[PDB]
Copies of this chain bind each other. A is one copy, B any other.
Amino acid sequence: LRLDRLQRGVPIVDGQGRPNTQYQNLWQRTVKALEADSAATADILQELADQLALIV
């Protein structure tokens, strides 16, 4: 769940420049968190527009 940091002695890249499984999955997790948080922000905006009118 928690986004991990890059280890000092662990290689994130293979010999030919391709990313290994660990770094690929870490990037996948980071991008998924990006999309989920952006969707949450959009929902916040929409319901704020709903409630900006609700209280008034």
How many monomers of this protein are in the complex? Answer: 3
Contact yes or no, A19 B12, CB < 8 A: yes
Size of the chain A interface, CB-CB below 8 angstroms: 39
**Cβ < 8 Å to B, chain A residues 38-56:** 38, 40-41, 44-45, 47-48, 51-52, 54-56
Given contacts A31-B30, A55-B56, contact A18 B24 (CB under 8 A): no
Sample (9) of A-B pairs whose CB atoms are under 8 Å apart: A2-B35, A12-B13, A12-B18, A14-B17, A30-B31, A33-B34, A44-B45, A51-B51, A54-B56
10 pairs of A and B residues whose beta carbons are closest in the complex: A11-B17, A55-B55, A13-B17, A3-B31, A6-B24, A6-B19, A11-B18, A13-B13, A6-B27, A5-B28
